[PDB]
Amino acid sequence: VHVGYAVLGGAAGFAATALGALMALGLRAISARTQDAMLGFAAGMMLAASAFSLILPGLDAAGTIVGPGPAAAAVVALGLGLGVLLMLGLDYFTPHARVNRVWLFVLTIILHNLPEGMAIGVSFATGDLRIGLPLTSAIAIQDVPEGLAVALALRAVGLPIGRAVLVAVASGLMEPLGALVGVGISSGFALAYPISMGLAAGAMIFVVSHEVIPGHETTATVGLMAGFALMMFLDTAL
Amino acid sequence: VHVGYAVLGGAAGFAATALGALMALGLRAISARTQDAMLGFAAGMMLAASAFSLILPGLDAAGTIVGPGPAAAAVVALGLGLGVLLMLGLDYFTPHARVNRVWLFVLTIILHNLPEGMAIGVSFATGDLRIGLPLTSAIAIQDVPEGLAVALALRAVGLPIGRAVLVAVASGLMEPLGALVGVGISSGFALAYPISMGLAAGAMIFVVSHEVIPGHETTATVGLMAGFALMMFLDTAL
């Protein structure tokens, strides 16, 4: 079934996060510019994952379901706006004393991860490996530096590196959960698939626009360019 | 010693090649445009590996050895021209009836691989992990799609996929050999290091300029851009 490809896609999600987190054991600390570059790469990957692997495939799905006119782009775009609105609804409904500021930063990481799991599941809802696999693989690529980054950031707020890595790994647990959810919401009816692809792309564009906010400027855009270029390459080859 | 980091860098070389080759077992055949994209990515990685990880570090090495004037850039540039001339000397001295055209294509792959092993060894000749590790890791990244590509190409000239993959893996054996050689030629005297960095960068720019020759045009430049962008990202983060 679809859940299968979605469950293994989420699984690669969690593994990749865990690998980055485990790399944090060696390093313990990293320069500000290297962390900025890593994040910029991760945002570039996500920005184009939602463009090339979610919106355009979503529009083509919608186009076969309802025809070539604006109805399809309307479905995809309304799903996308719904995804923005949902991530904006969380973030308000969700707050994010050292013990409590660690919890708020963890909530940030979990709210971040929710859309990416969802996107993996949504991409594997038609069983289409030519939509799930490049998406999923981009998600996992950028999960590595982000697990690294997450664990280091938690060490930096005051945790011993071991707890920091343990919490990063647990964080990565949110990808398969979101994969189950994305495979849920995208199977109830025909339009559920392109609606869900819009919705996933929108949620990701929101977490990026809300976390691209973090000198340390020229370095993060080299990363963003790299991560965006690499995605285009993945879309073409896969 | 330096040979240690060089031997493990070469080792990652061979492993990566083998992983791409093993992936060819599943696929057996691939579209022309996906193979072109893969190669374009591999050329972009190499082009910037020789720029950002060989020439500029080579110039800085040369600059500390002989001073900031043109003497350093002269050493690096003369090494680079020597590397072009050496790869041009091979290719003439080296030819590259199905059984014999497979051997000529294998010779092509071995002549291709020689500079990359050398570059790994040259990058680890000062023991400087900030020069070897990003270089080495770029070499291994692009060894994966190139093992894939090599094995598929050999299947396509008429080999059974099993022999094709076996020969691709064996091919990847040339990276640690070249790592030993690059760690040799770069240790005999002080200038040997920046001379060798020029030489490695030049040999690679030659094999790229000689194999970038292969419609199927717009797709390979998406790959080249991606592979070049990714290298910049690696140079910055590592």
Numbering used by the authors:
A (entry chain A), B (entry chain A): 54 to 149, 162 to 279, 285 to 308
Please give the exact wording used by the authors of the publication that reports this structure.
ZIPs represent the only identified zinc importers in mammals, providing metal transfer from the extracellular space or from internal storage vesicles to the cytoplasm. The identified ZIP fold is unique and consists primarily of a transmembrane domain of eight pseudo-symmetrically arranged transmembrane segments (TMs) 1 to 8.
The metal-free and metal-bound conformations represent the structures determined here, while the outward-open state is a generated model. Bound Cd2+ ions are shown as purple spheres. To investigate zinc-dependent movement of the transport domain, we aligned the metal-free and metal-bound structures using the static scaffold domains. Minimization of these distances through stepwise translation of the transport domain across the membrane suggests that an 8 Å rearrangement toward the extracellular side is necessary, relative to the metal-bound inward-facing state.
